Symmetry: C3
């Protein structure tokens, strides 16, 4: 509940503000977005920062933060560590929206979109399971491994059929740019988890781990959404003719 | 757990019965519904009261009811209030079904339907967060505000592309009728929350707040479903030719 | 937490291994699967055992297992029984994937698929509610009944429009085979629940109830997925031309 750690607190308030600014910027950027495909991607994009603000409020309020006892074998075994589990939970809604926006832009098959969102949800929930598991270190990492497997299913779409769809949709250029951002930035999350306090605890500062995720969110969500939306606004014809 | 409040109890049992009657009435009304679009909307409609009964059983049984301590600043700060949080949770399944039924009727784009359901889920979960937050009054209302934002995303579809789709689908007349019912009745829920015990507590009776939601459910679900289904039965050609 | 019951333990470890073997077998079987419809169903199929392993890890670790006090009237009223509620929870992700795979194979309408998954989720969550309800025996069984109603909605699709779609998709033969497996095997789950400790408790052994579900999973998931995938690999043309 209580929080007397400026490093930790700032990592949360900073994104409530940035997500707030993004929403306002995006609403504005869509001021003259033609109806149909464009406006639709605009809405899906607007919600990325909307879900994000919700996540940070959950954390700030303490609603989605808890103390978890680390199991034998862990660097901090027998100690209680602060787990921002609300991040893992909300990702289950925000990442599917990122994929929805990218999917619409690439005009992929509804079936493919379906499979990818399911895989994404699996990645998120198994990640939450890894954080919440306390009986044995083995199970925490086994969940981490399965979460990685779901992540691979998600990435497989980006490297295969979603790319072929963007080409036929005339959005290959922007898709290729956005694809690099997703693969590189999304890989940062499991690294932070593994290096941070809930993983190997190479970095034992909860404030530091929190800032890492917050910085990733700035680029994987706000900047990502800005780049996607800006392109759509300057290429309404191409996306509308889908 | 215990409940010795007839006002409160009746508000729940009344809808177990009404939802039960609706199911039977709807199954009957679909007795001679031709396969395809019609029968499909019939099924989606049948589940609205099915999910509803589930919600009321959760409440009646006490499974989805809990005591929450109100934070400083609240009219009942320092007191425990009864929170029917199961309502907020089940809305996450029932409202998407209402939107699914309306979406099929209007024959909207799968992508649009997707975005709307996601926004709807966000509205529901942030509403639950508002009710469950106890650390500060500020966060309870911040969640209420974000939930309203998601609600606006949902309504935006009804006022734009979903309406244009119904027109091209030849279902503009029934859609326009159903749209008014959704906008007006759905607006009643955040008013009840704000006026009731979990919000401003202008009305401090949990029994009264419960009845308000129950009455809204009767119209937003049962009556709404009746009107939609009855039209579909008398206009199978128009919906089937979609 | 603690578990000193070989009968119970083996029922869980056995499927971590079998689900692990299935994943490896399926990845292999897809080695030369042409892109498009085939590869897509391959991915959806690969995740069935992926979600399954996740479920068993939750159970093995104790994360998704709890003690529930049975209400008056129950054969074990006033006693605490072990509830593998993680099974019910994960089914909410794995069963929709089974239906997704079957739906893609049958090339059904996106709207129908949507309605079926929602009904499936309802069946799973009401089943979880039945297990978690402790105030009265009446409510436990009322949830069981509603869950059955959702199950009927799911089955209705398999006996109607999904079958007509498979015919037009040229996949009627494999669909008919898979449909029998789903109807017969899926019916086994509510029987186990009713006969086992959480239901009528005709069988009071948690180890025995666990093995029943595990055996059902072997056929409803692993064998089912094998049959589906093998057919797709030998009939790529038919599925691709969808
Ligand atoms: C807006 C937030 C985003 C884009 C978050 C992305 C999160 C992931 C790619 C998380 C992945 C993880 C694994 C692959 C292994 C288990 C631990 C996680 C959940 C951090
Ligand atoms: C069957 C039940 C229905 C149609 C329920 C609808 C509920 C809403 C439109 C709820 C909306 C709310 C907000 C916009 C603000 C936060 C509080 C809520 C969850 C009551
Ligand atoms: C991989 C696991 C599968 C295919 C599980 C299927 C589960 C069901 C068909 C469960 C159904 C139930 C009812 C119809 C009544 C309430 C109890 C349940 C949840 C066991
Ligand atoms: C998919 C990758 C899985 C890697 C599993 C790593 C399991 C080791 O686990 C690690 O062991 C260290 C030494 O005992 C501890 O200090 C760390 O806290 C602990 O997380
Ligand atoms: C989107 C609309 C947000 C409105 C935020 C209202 C915040 C005020 O909150 C209200 O303050 C009153 C006086 O202190 C209390 O009596 C009420 O219980 C409390 O909810
Ligand atoms: C859809 C089918 C619903 C069946 C409802 C059955 C309700 C009876 O419930 C059963 O009663 C027995 C005798 O009292 C007990 O021994 C069992 O434990 C209890 O589950
Ligand atoms: C278009 C389909 C989207 C499906 C999304 C499925 C998963 C929903 C996850 C909801 C998480 C909600 C928790 C919010 C918590 C918070 O921010 O306080
Ligand atoms: C389909 C969306 C449903 C919305 C569910 C919202 C609430 C999620 C609650 C998750 C609780 C799990 C974390 C417990 C953490 C702890 O031990 O404190
Ligand atoms: C067609 C997609 C629909 C997606 C629905 C996603 C959200 C599921 C919410 C499930 C809530 C289940 C809780 C039921 C509680 C009860 O009534 O006892
Ligand atoms: C995707 C669907 C998942 C189904 C999840 C069903 C169970 C939801 C449990 C929500 C618990 C949150 C409320 C806690 C309330 C309290 O403090 O008593
Ligand atoms: C294609 C849409 C699929 C929608 C799926 C909606 C329901 C998600 C259910 C997630 C359950 C996750 C719990 C996993 C628990 C565990 O194995 O440890
Ligand atoms: C949309 C997916 C959300 C993922 C939610 C994952 C966590 C589910 C937690 C369910 C808790 C309900 C069971 C409580 C059992 C008990 O009493 O021990
Ligand atoms: Cl988020
Ligand atoms: Cl924190
Ligand atoms: Cl409801
Ligand atoms: Cl109540
Ligand atoms: Cl499962
Ligand atoms: Cl167990």
């Amino acid at each position: 509940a209580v929080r007397e750690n400026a490093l930790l607190s700032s990592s949360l308030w900073v994104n409530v503000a940035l997500a707030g600014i993004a929403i306002l910027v995006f609403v504005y950027m869509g001021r003259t977005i033609r109806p149909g495909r464009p406006r639709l991607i605009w809405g899906a994009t607007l919600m990325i920062p909307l879900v994000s603000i919700s996540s940070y409020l959950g954390l700030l309020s303490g609603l989605t933060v808890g103390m978890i006892e680390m199991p034998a074998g862990h660097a901090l075994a027998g100690e209680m560590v602060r787990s921002q589990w609300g991040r893992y939970l909300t990702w289950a809604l925000s990442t599917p929206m990122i994929l929805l926006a990218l999917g619409l832009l690439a005009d992929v098959d509804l079936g493919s979109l379906f499979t990818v969102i399911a895989a994404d949800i699996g990645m998120c929930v198994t990640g939450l399971a890894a954080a919440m598991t306390t009986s044995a270190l083995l199970f925490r990492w086994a969940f981490y491994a399965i979460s990685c497997a779901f992540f691979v299913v998600v990435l497989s779409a980006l490297v295969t059929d979603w790319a072929a769809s963007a080409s036929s949709a005339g959005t290959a250029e922007i898709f290729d740019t956005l694809r690099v951002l997703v693969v590189v930035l999304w890989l940062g999350y499991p690294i932070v988890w593994a290096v941070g306090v809930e993983g190997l605890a190479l970095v034992q500062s909860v404030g530091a781990t929190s800032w890492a995720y917050s910085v990733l969110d700035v680029f994987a969500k706000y900047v990502f959404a800005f780049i996607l939306l800006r392109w759509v606004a300057n290429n309404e014809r191409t996306v509308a003719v889908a």
